[PDB]
Curated annotation (Swiss-Prot), chains A, B:
Phenotypic consequence of C333Y: In CALJA; absence from the plasma-membrane; exhibits no catalytic AMPase activity
CDD domains tied to this protein: MPP_CD73_N
Cofactor(s) essential for the protein: Zn(2+)
Protein known as: 5'-nucleotidase
Binding site for IMP: R329, N354, R359, F381, F464, D470
Associated disease: Calcification of joints and arteries: A condition characterized by adult-onset calcification of the lower extremity arteries, including the iliac, femoral and tibial arteries, and hand and foot capsule joints. Age of onset has been reported as early as the second decade of life, usually involving intense joint pain or calcification in the hands.
A Pfam family annotated for this UniProt entry: 5_nucleotid_C
Binding residues annotated for Zn(2+) 2, in chain numbering: D11, D60, N92, H195, H218
Residue numbers binding Zn(2+) 1: D11, H13, D60
Organism, as annotated: Homo sapiens
Record family assignment: Belongs to the 5'-nucleotidase family.
BP terms from Gene Ontology: adenosine biosynthetic process; ADP catabolic process; AMP catabolic process; ATP metabolic process; calcium ion homeostasis; DNA metabolic process; inhibition of non-skeletal tissue mineralization; leukocyte cell-cell adhesion
Keyword set includes Glycoprotein: yes
Lipid attachment points (GPI-anchor amidated serine): S513
Length: 513, 513
């Protein structure tokens, strides 16, 4: 009989400073949430109350806000060290700044094991990272040992910039020998901590024999048993119970994203390291839990650098800039419309944009003041808006891909400019596009004329889509001409200043049967 | 066996200086048309070829271009005197500058009879304007007399500001005693010259016993026998033959508008002043007819004052600003979209605009340069964009009115901003609106939601529509609140400068089944 409490965050994405209800910049501080300082209070509060506790992270601490743009990992290592994190799995966004952008700020400065069993190293890089990350860590909790095995998304080479001298083996295949190794090492209790998404977490739980619990991330999954405290609608109960082939009931947990919730999972274990009972719920980190003062003071010490890099007004918004996943990945969101307008205004009649790239909404309640900061949250990656030459057939395929797996918060949903697309989800994937009228360019007056397969159109789109990202291989493998455009933020920054006061709308660009 | 040639212009609307194929400012002078100087050449050319000729005008020289804004009638009297016009009927736009702004520049300076039989004067104005205009004029042509009887639109009190001491009696009723008078005065030939439109011209021809020929205007009707020389599609043959009740075939003519065509009509008359034969066609005044040099020199000697009209680009257009009647009064024209955007940007989610108020397109081929001159052609009246508070039922009625007599180049067709209307012309007038989704204002993110009858909307529209013009009595008799807005031109002038480079489009705001 042993009691362990697992506390977990996943996909925080640089929300060190407290955010709004929608994870945008904290506007109303009385009705504000999350943050590293507020989490310190709840973590500390749990730590004293429970006997054996583990604060874990399932990746994606990188990107999302100006904190990352400025410190590039210095904030993550400093504040995760401050919060005394027990362990963290490598996320796909941890490789965004190349291999050194992982080695120099985080891997060298972290006072905690950073894990990953399915990443193997070769050649020059082989000895550089050797020992900086481990496949597993056997933490001594009380008078028991707990083995944590890490894993990072198999698709990280596509999804980010991990490098050429790192190899991403299959999760379940690379995890099993490491779990079996730990079992022989008399490690009765195995947590698997990884960044591969909910569906992959569930088969890990069902397939990897010996994993007592799965703590994942990547997909921003929100799980809840009961009536949720906020706008987040749950995908299942907390914990999600997977019945392994072993005959065990393996709990699977996720904490949404942006440090809005601290995942709490209490576990009763037997003499042999088997879950007898488990229960919990992700704790909503809201104003009812005070931000720890000493830790918040350090955030303010690290804020004056961030202040200079976004302490002035660029434009004003009278509409709420809806840059939320719930809207931008399922329907035409006004933020996507704004960015597309900004793109064409920077030069072409068509713009295409992956909803996945819309990382943050912008709140108009702060009188509409749109600062450099509000916006480096919407566009945190520093890509560009590149010119392309596409065939009508090529564009029809991309729209077909746009809703190929619709309804799974995937980022391949397109936000458009100068395109009027209508979808029918009742039909089979591959024949769901019902209309695609595009804005004419040879014409003297622009009018929407249906797309012709055999005609060549000039579309402006992010570097990510030109690179063939989000599975848009047809764009990369069928384009006629690609051109290096201007920096993504500066396209929206120059447009906002030019407009002075903005007000985009859902005007029927994307429609559904 | 008498031969009379009637030469006629109608609705020139201040196109003294030659214009483009679309009556906008002359861009390419080698492919340019119309104008007072070019007309002088063709008129003089006809005059020396034919024996008995009459140069007549059926109204509307006033308003249209900056020539009228600056000289307010000095140009009309000076150049019509130069062109040696024989007679002119009063048009509805002649009263645009009140009753004094007609008498002071034109009525006192014209070296030709200005006619109108259906305008009667009362009280103070009675003796002021006594003799300045006449109901008829008996011109001596060769060794014969020709009686011309004038008429101005019955609805001029609504259509413009004709003062308060002028009374507009019915045309056919006021014309008949004057034609009967002339017949008793032994005046065998009667040509009726008036500004009431084509349909009214045809009933005048059928009904007023004794009228040998009708030469009209107001409706910009283009008539042609054969293959037309330009974009103007004809409404009938030239001359249009009306069969009068007293067994005569009465010819009816019109020469489109803007001085693009000089209407030519050949007439064989009998001993008793009866048309035996008649034939003609409106002559396309193009570069193939040279502009008379002496007269063009005078146009340039005056032009010098008009030159200080923003001879610097307020803004640039990359699209052709389609401000033509053919588009703006039948479908959603990009010019109407531009003005509506300018109105909401000015200071509300909805804008409505009468297509009639779009008096001129703007040509983007002149390096895209938009000047105060160009804008004065689109918006020549000096109205204002007023705020209104109308209920859904009231707006639904206005949209029904919009297409109540659709297809007759009437100005009550609405151009919109933040409104998405769909019409079905197959249905009965009063049941023609199938969709009317409006842009929400109480919402945080603007989205198009269907209009509710019992809800109030805050629409921005011209003062012309607010004081119930174009038969939109429902606007004037059902509004909840009206507010004095900014000047029409200055709303578009401030918007263009703010945007720097504009590019409106036909984006589906107005649609049809
Ligand atoms: C230049 C491109 C910048 N990046 C990052 C990035 C990509 C690839 C390399 C990279 C360099 N190289 C080497 C070139 F030689 N190979 N590869 C680097 C960085 C990106 N840009 C845009 Cl526009 N969108 C991006 C994006 N990354 C991701 N999304 C979106 O994120 C969505 C998922 O979001 P989520 O569910 O919260 C899961 P997670 O992102 O929280 O892990 C997707 O559907 C995408 O649409
Ligand atoms: C402040 C309003 C300015 N005006 C002029 C005007 C109206 C009325 C008074 C007037 C002052 N008052 C007194 C107020 F206390 N009563 N009445 C003066 C001037 C106007 N404004 C706008 Cl927005 N549109 C106008 C307009 N006039 C006409 N259209 C349009 O012209 C179309 C027809 O064009 P057409 O076929 O070429 C025939 P014609 O105009 O060549 O004769 C119509 O359908 C209208 O839409
Ligand atoms: Zn993430
Ligand atoms: Zn991730
Ligand atoms: Zn006219
Ligand atoms: Zn008229």
């Amino acid at each position: 009989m042993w009691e362990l409490t697992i506390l977990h965050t996943n996909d925080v994405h640089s929300r060190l400073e407290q955010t709004s209800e929608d994870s945008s910049k904290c506007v109303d501080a009385s009705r504000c949430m999350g943050g590293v300082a507020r989490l310190f209070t709840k973590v500390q509060q749990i730590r004293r109350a429970e006997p054996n506790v583990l604060l874990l992270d399932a990746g994606d601490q990188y990107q999302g806000t100006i904190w990352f743009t400025v410190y590039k990992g210095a904030e993550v290592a400093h504040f995760m060290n401050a919060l005394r994190y027990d362990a963290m799995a490598l996320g796909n966004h941890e490789f965004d700044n190349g291999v050194e952008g992982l080695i120099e700020p985080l891997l060298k400065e972290a006072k905690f094991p950073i894990l990953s069993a399915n990443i193997k190293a070769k050649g020059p890089l082989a000895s550089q990272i050797s020992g900086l990350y481990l496949p597993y860590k056997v933490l001594p909790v009380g008078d028991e040992v707990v083995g944590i095995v890490g894993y990072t998304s198999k698709e990280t080479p596509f999804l980010s910039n991990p490098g050429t001298n790192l190899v991403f083996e299959d999760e379940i295949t690379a995890l099993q020998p490491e779990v079996d190794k730990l079992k022989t090492l008399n490690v009765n209790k195995i947590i698997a901590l990884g960044h591969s998404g909910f569906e992959m977490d569930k088969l890990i739980a069902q397939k990897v024999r010996g994993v007592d619990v799965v703590v994942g991330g990547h997909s921003n999954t929100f799980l809840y048993t009961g009536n949720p405290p906020s706008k987040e609608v749950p995908a299942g109960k907390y914990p999600f119970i997977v019945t392994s082939d072993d005959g065990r009931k393996v709990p699977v947990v996720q904490a949404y994203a942006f440090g809005k919730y601290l995942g709490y999972l209490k576990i009763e274990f037997d003499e042999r390291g088997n879950v007898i009972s488990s229960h919990g719920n992700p704790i909503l980190l809201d104003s009812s839990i005070p931000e720890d003062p000493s830790i918040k003071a350090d955030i303010n010490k690290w804020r004056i650098k961030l202040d200079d890099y976004s302490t002035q007004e660029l434009g004003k918004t009278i509409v709420y800039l809806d840059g939320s996943s719930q809207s931008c990945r399922f329907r035409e969101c006004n933020m996507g419309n704004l960015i597309c307008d900004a793109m064409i205004n920077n030069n072409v009649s068509m713009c295409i944009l992956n909803g996945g790239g819309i990382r943050s909404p912008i709140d108009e309640r702060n009188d509409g003041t749109i600062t450099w900061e509000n916006l480096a949250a919407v566009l945190p990656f520093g890509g560009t808006f590149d010119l392309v030459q596409l065939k009508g057939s090529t564009l029809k395929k991309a729209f077909e891909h746009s809703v190929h797996r619709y309804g799974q918060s995937t980022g391949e949903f397109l936000q458009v400019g100068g395109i009027h697309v209508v979808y029918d989800l009742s039909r089979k994937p591959g024949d769901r596009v019902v209309k695609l009228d595009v804005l004419c360019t040879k014409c003297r007056v622009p009018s929407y004329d249906p797309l012709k397969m055999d005609e060549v159109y000039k579309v402006i789109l992010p570097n990510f889509l030109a690179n063939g990202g989000d599975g848009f291989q047809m764009i990369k493998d069928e384009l006629l001409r690609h051109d290096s455009g201007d920096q993504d933020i500066n396209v929206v920054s120059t447009y906002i200043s030019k407009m002075k006061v903005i007000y985009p709308a859902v005007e029927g660009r994307i429609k559904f049967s």
